[PDB]
Design a protein around this ligand. Structure first.
Ligand SMILES: CN(C(=O)c1cc2ccccc2cc1C(=O)[C@@H](c1cccc2ccccc12)P(=O)(O)O)C1CCN(C(=O)c2ccc3ccccc3c2)CC1
Length: 224
């Protein structure tokens, strides 16, 4: 998170920290609990081995509030295209159900096809980098304004306004960044987006996956 603030501890109990590929420090991503047995995140974060940490604030400490679970299944969206980064969404079925409590619980999702008006203020959270040189051990968050789709349609090649969201006013140094991938974009406290990608500089507008266009698939995949 660039230009944000440290989050009040445990104020976003749905936050999940992902470590992809056993090797400690091999790859980091964010995600969010949607049910006691499922975590939603980005498909470009896929790996053969994913360790999930729920209930954390400082992910570099084995906190009493944490619950550690491995991804039993890492289900990439069937039409995920890593080259164009389209359909960047993935469901992680946890090896075991979390014990739901004040520090670990699901987040509300948008209804099917729910959109977002440009100018709306949303919040994204994560343990990603705060700059090219600095990262963070603790959860941070920042408020960003939804942008008109035309901006991302000009900047990013394959953008689809139905399946993606254009976020971040270029006039402010605030945005989700490297390591925040997979994390949620909360608009009116509902998880409308998943951090997908943006410029390597971190200067917005940036692209989020629009959760509301994938409800049928999410439903089906979870209706196991
Ligand atoms: C150097 N970068 C970044 O520092 C970066 C910037 C971001 C800016 C805003 C929001 C999220 C961001 C995530 C990252 C990453 O490095 C991700 C990461 C690692 C490896 C492969 C990935 C494949 C798809 C999505 C995330 C990926 P990571 O977070 O998973 O580690 C990323 C910039 C975006 N990328 C592009 O090809 C890309 C595509 C079209 C573009 C069009 C215009 C300008 C830049 C463009 C850059 C990938 C690497």
């Amino acid at each position: 998170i660039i230009g944000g603030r440290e989050s009040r501890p445990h104020s976003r109990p749905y936050m999940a920290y992902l470590q992809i590929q056993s090797p400690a420090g091999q790859s980091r991503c964010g995600g969010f609990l949607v049910r006691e047995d499922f975590v939603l995140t980005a498909a470009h974060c896929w790996g053969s081995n994913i360790n999930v940490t729920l209930g954390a604030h400082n992910i570099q400490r084995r906190e009493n509030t944490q619950q550690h679970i491995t991804a039993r299944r890492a289900i990439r969206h069937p039409q995920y295209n890593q080259r164009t980064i389209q359909n960047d969404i993935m469901l992680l079925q946890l090896s075991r159900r979390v014990r739901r409590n004040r520090n670990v619980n699901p987040v509300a999702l948008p209804r099917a096809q729910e959109g977002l008006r440009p100018g709306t203020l949303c919040t994204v959270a994560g343990w990603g980098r705060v700059s090219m040189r600095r990262g963070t051990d603790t959860l941070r968050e920042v408020q960003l304004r939804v942008q008109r789709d035309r901006q991302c349609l000009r900047i990013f090649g394959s953008y689809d306004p139905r399946r993606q969201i254009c976020v971040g006013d270029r006039r402010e140094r605030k945005a989700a960044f490297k390591g925040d991938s997979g994390g949620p974009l909360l608009c009116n406290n509902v998880a409308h987006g998943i951090v997908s990608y943006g410029k390597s500089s971190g200067v917005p507008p940036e692209v989020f996956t629009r959760v509301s266009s994938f409800l049928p698939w999410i439903r089906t995949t979870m209706r196991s």
